Specification:
The structure is a homodimer. Chain A is α+β, with helices and mostly antiparallel strands. Among the domains of chain A are: 10-89, Trypsin-like serine proteases (Thrombin, subunit H); 199-298, main proteinase (3clpro) structure, domain 3. Helices cover 23% and strands 27% of the residues of chain A. In chain A, a hairpin with a 2-residue loop joins β9 and β10 (119-127). In chain A, α3 (199-211) packs parallel to α8 (291-298) and α4 packs parallel to α7. The radius of gyration of chain A is 22 Å and the shape is elongated. The complex binds ligand V2M (2 copies). Residues 25, 39, 47, 138-143, 162-164, 166, 170, 185, 187-189 of chain B line the site of one ligand V2M. One copy of the ligand *[C@@](O)(CO)[C@H](C[C@@H]1CCNC1=O)NC(=O)[C@H](CC(C)C)NC(=O)c1cc2c(OC)cccc2[nH]1 binds at residues 25, 37, 39, 47, 138-143, 162-164, 166, 170, 185-189 of chain A.
Chain lengths: 299, 298
């Protein structure tokens, strides 16, 4: 079981670079709009304490350099939506895929296409942590890189990169410019909330073990969802939502193990430990495979 | 610090589906040639012990159905090079990238674009292990998926997928059709040689952990190269060469930890264990990052 990204080609064809003054980052070119982080309009000094509505009044269309490779796309309009800038360009991208903009929940995974100067560099899978950070791999010039899932050739864009925290994890927005978590696009040291283990994904991992014949941890007990949530919080595990219970439905049906029965097995694991045993070869419980990832790989 | 694959778009544009009778797998369409595993010509019966030259002479161009998304490509010629079939088509692939075929050495990494029915499905990083297997994620229908590296828009293809061993590791060929390792394209259970750990990669990864602010495994000791290799061979690690020491130079300079100091640290980890602790999130010593992988990403 390994972390697999989606093929990145459909997103590669949408990556551009956006420069204002000397400040350069990446943008996403879909139809005749380029989406990028709004702090491109800031000078290094401005980012310390920017007033974005005031910085944007000073900008005109002709202040924006949008390039696909070294080919300039002329900007014919601009607007600000939350923390993203939308630049209307005179050319509709012929490589635009079928797409949607979606806001994901904590625990969900997505592929990140890390980009520099408009040029894709690498691709890897990330999980949104419950403190709304991702454990990415980003260097200077990576802002505007995007995260996505692909469902039957439709690209659901869910992340645009803005920030590296002092702890080394990363934070960003959806494609409507709304940050995940309590972060702000200022050049300031911000701290994330305490992380928690992603319970719904640990349960997915346990189903994956069962599918593969590794089922020693299945016990004879069950639990209510409220009782489980109150115990889980004492082990720094996230409480389950109704949506979590329902996305475990397919794996529960496939194995015949009720969701709440698996919760009872996890509860026993948390209270008593692995006792030196392993699950899928590992002494650690994995929390960055979603139920979707598990079926995506298992079947 | 993450296992990071190359962007796969240049390879996606080359994946096609190849069908012979009841048998289907993936092919790689470059210019006017489709490369695919030769066992596509085998029925279930043939695959137990196939005489590939005999089976191929009995095939016609029309026996090969090649589909690129929706379009069907007319096969106008075919030849076999070792375990790889080369289907000449009457259409050149307009999306062919600048490319090369290379054969990689153990320890080197590459990106895998896992495909099913000629449609790309996922991308992830693999390393060619010392026993010439790879730890991949491949299901039924994945044969003909390829591995590659990308250097300034040139795709260097190094792997075509053929088989999953009983242990769950994977085996395949270069794009000349020569297997990595002692494996053969017959429907049999095959074991690999002993899996020595790629030492220079474990050391590169320990440097990655320091560059990302983790030092708990460092120590005040040093070791000679030979004394380290004695311990390495005892734990079935590959002996470290002076070329390996040289390749680790940049990470040592960037970090200020001499290579032999990091070897003393790895020696301690091999002798004491990790004592329940973790490095870069891993409970195990990671051996699938090369020194270049660490430099490029950091
Ligand atoms: C984008 O590339 C910027 O356009 C960049 C990406 C990060 C650089 C290193 N890795 C990354 O992911 N973003 C930034 O530099 C942002 C810019 C803001 C939103 C205006 N700033 C930070 O990520 C940032 C600032 C500070 C800081 O200050 C002082 C102190 C500590 C951490 C920190 N991160
Ligand atoms: C291909 O896709 C075939 O076109 C398939 C890929 C594997 C299936 C499951 N995961 C994979 O990576 N490859 C095979 O099925 C090959 C075909 C050979 C080369 C003709 N066979 C095996 O991988 C294989 C056969 C046997 C076996 O026999 C008996 C016993 C144990 C393991 C095993 N693997």
């Amino acid at each position: 079981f390994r972390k697999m990204a989606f093929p990145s080609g459909k997103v590669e064809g949408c990556m551009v670079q956006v420069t204002c003054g000397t400040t350069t980052l990446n943008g996403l070119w879909l139809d005749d709009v380029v989406y990028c982080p709004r702090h491109v309009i800031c000078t290094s000094e401005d980012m310390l304490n920017p007033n974005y509505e005031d910085l944007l009044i000073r900008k005109s269309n002709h202040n924006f350099l949008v390039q696909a490779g070294n080919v300039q796309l002329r900007v014919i309009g601009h607007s600000m939506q939350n923390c993203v800038l939308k630049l209307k360009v005179d050319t509709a991208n012929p490589k635009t895929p079928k797409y949607k903009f979606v806001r994901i929940q904590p625990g969900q995974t997505f592929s990140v296409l890390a980009c520099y100067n408009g040029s894709p560099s690498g691709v890897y899978q990330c999980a949104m942590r419950h403190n709304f950070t991702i454990k990415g791999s980003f260097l200077n010039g990576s802002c505007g890189s995007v995260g996505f899932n692909i469902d039957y050739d439709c690209v659901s864009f869910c992340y645009m990169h803005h920030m590296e925290l002092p702890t080394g994890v990363h934070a960003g927005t959806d494609l409507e410019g709304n940050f995940y978590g309590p972060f702000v696009d200022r050049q300031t040291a911000q701290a994330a909330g305490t992380d928690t283990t992603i319970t719904v994904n640990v349960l997915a991992w346990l189903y994956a073990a069962v599918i593969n014949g590794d089922r020693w941890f299945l016990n004879r007990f069950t639990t209510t969802l409220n009782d489980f949530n109150l115990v889980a919080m004492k082990y720094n595990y996230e409480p389950l939502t109704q949506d979590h219970v329902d996305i475990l439905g397919p794996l529960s049906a496939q194995t015949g193990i009720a969701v709440l029965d698996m919760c009872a097995s996890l509860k026993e694991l948390l209270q008593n430990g692995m006792n030196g045993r392993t699950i899928l070869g590992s002494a650690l419980l994995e929390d960055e495979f979603t139920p979707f990832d598990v079926v995506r790989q298992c079947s």
